[PDB]
Amino acid sequence: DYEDEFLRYLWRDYLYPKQYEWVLIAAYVAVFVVALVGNTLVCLAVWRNHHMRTVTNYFIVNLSLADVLVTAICLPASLLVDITESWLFGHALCKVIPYLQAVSVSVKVLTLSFIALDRWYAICHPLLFKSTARRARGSILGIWAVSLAIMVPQAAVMECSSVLPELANRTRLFSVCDERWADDLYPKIYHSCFFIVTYLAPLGLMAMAYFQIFRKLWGRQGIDCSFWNESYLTGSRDERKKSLLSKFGMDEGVTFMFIGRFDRGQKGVDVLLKAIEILSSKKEFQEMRFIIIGKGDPELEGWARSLEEKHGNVKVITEMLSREFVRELYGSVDFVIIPSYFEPFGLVALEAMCLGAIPIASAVGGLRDIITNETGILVKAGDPGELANAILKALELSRSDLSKFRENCKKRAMSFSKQMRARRKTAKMLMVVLLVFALCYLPISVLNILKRVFGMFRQASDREAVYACFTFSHWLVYANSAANPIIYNFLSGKFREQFKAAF
Ligand SMILES: CC[C@H](C)[C@H]1CN(c2nc3cc(Cl)ccc3o2)CCCN1C(=O)c1cc(C)ccc1-n1nccn1
Ligand SMILES: CC(C)CCC[C@@H](C)[C@H]1CC[C@H]2[C@@H]3CC=C4C[C@@H](O)CC[C@]4(C)[C@H]3CC[C@]12C
Ligand SMILES: CCCCCCCC/C=C\CCCCCCCC(=O)O
16 A cells, blocks of 8 residues: 555655756846845835835835735745755745745735826826825735735645655655645635735726726827927027018918818818908908918818918918928917817827917817816817907907017926826836736746645645756746846936935
8 A cells, every 4th residue: 555655665765966056046146136125226216216206106116015925035045945856944834935935926016006097097097096105005004904814814725844744764865835724625616716816806906997097098209309499490489480481472460370280170271261261351350360280071172272362361381391390490480270079189289388379279078178268278189169259369469569479388398298207107117017027926926826726736746847847937927026126227327326326
C-alpha cells in the first residue's frame, strides 16, 4: 500500500539544484530595490509639493504604500521559498505573510477602482463630480478596513505542515506552508470568488469606465497655440479690418465671418444665408458687413453668390486659402459665426478666439463647453430668427469697446486648449498603470483558479514545469511594484520634476 511513504523515505535527501539560481536572485533583488526606492519617491513627491496634492495622486500614494508593504515583507519570503522549496520562517508567518499579500492585492485593486471612478465622473459627468480630499481620506480608510476584514479567511486557513498527514514517523528535513481546508469543495468557492472579486469584475468595470473616458476624449488634443496667436500679425485690428474690407471692396463696418463646409444640416451655412435674408430688411443691416467662406454643393454656393450680387456688403470666398490667411482673417474681423447643427469639436471657435474674434455660435456640442458667459453669444441651433437677433446683439455691442471681451476670449480659448491635453495625458498614464497591473497578476490568478478548482498541476513531469511557472508568476507579481513608479516617471513630468529634486 505505502508507495508515498517509502518513496519519500528514499528520495527525501534528493536535493536538485537549479541551473539559474543567481538569475532569479538578481531579478528579485532588482525588483526589491527599484520598487522600494521608486514608491518612496512617489510618496515624497506628493508629500513635499502642494501642487501634487490631487485626489488622483492621493490614491496613487495609497498604491505606492501597498507596494512598499509587499516589497518589504513578501518579496524576500517568496525568493527564499522559490529557491529552497521550503518554508524557513515560523508557523505564525505562514499565516501572516500570505494574509498581507492578499490584503495588498485587495488594496491595489480597490485603489485603481476609485481612480477609475473619479476620472469617470470628472470626464463623463462633470456636473455630478463632487470630489474632495476629505472623501479620498475616508475612501482610503474604507479600502484598508474592507481589505483587512475580507482576507481574514486566508490567514485562517494557511498552515505549516511537513511529513505526510496521518503518519507516525515525523522525521523530516524541512517544512512547508500551504492552505489547509477541512472542506474539499469550499476551497473551489473561495478561489473562484477571489479570482472574480480581486481581478475579473473590477478589471471589467474599470475597462468600461476607461472605454467611456477615452471615447469622450478622442480627437481632443487642443490647437497649436504657437501658430494661432496675434504675434505674427502687423498693425492694429482697426487697420487690419480697414485693409481687409478695402481688398474685398467694402467700406468700414462691423464685420462678421463664417468659414466652413457649405453643408445643409451640419455646418449650418443655410441658416446663416436665411438670417442674412431676414436682415436684408430692417435698417441696421447697412452697418454690417459679412464674409462667407467655403465650398460645398451647388445649391448653397449659388444662393450665397445670389446674396453677394444682391447686397454690396456681402462677400463670398470659394478660393482655397492658406492657414496663415485664415489666421489673418480671424485677427481682422469683429465676430465669427458658427451656425452648425452638430459641431462636435469646435476647433473654429478656439482658433478664432485665440486671435480675438468673438464667436457667435449655435449652442450644440463642444461649442457649449468652450463658449461660456462673458466670452460669446450662444443661439438655439437651426433657428435663423434667433441667429438674426444674435447678430443684432453683436452689433449693439460693437457700438461700444469690446477689447477686454476679446482678451477674455483669448484667455478662455488658451486655457481650454491646454486643459484637454492634461486630461488626455492623465488618462493615458492611468490606463497604462491599469494594464501593467492586469498583466502582472494575470498568470498567477489563472494558475490559482486552475490549481484550486479544476484539478491539475499534481501529476507526472507536470511538477518541474509547475515549479518554473509559479516561480516566474511570483516574480512578475512583484515586478508590478517596480513598474508603476517607472510609469509615473515616463508619463508625467510632474513626477519627473520631483524625482530629479531628490538629487
Ligand atoms: C494574494 C494571496 C494569494 C491567494 C496567495 C496566497 N498564498 C501565498 N503563499 C505565499 C507565500 C509567500 Cl512566501 C508569500 C505570499 C504567499 O501567499 C498561497 C495561496 C495562493 N497565493 C498565491 O499563489 C500567490 C502567491 C504570491 C506570492 C503572490 C500572489 C498570489 N496570488 N494568488 C492569487 C493572486 N495572487
Ligand atoms: C537593510 C537594508 C538593506 C534596507 C535598504 C532599504 C533602502 C533601499 C531604503 C531605506 C531608506 C530609503 C531612502 C529614504 C530617503 C531617501 C531620500 C529621497 O530624497 C530619495 C530616496 C531615498 C534615498 C530612499 C532610497 C531607498 C532607501 C535607501
Ligand atoms: C481596456 C479598455 C481600453 C479602452 C480603449 C480606448 C477606447 C477608445 C475607442 C475609440 C473611440 C471611438 C472614436 C470614433 C471614431 C470615429 C471616426 C470614424 O467614424 O471614422
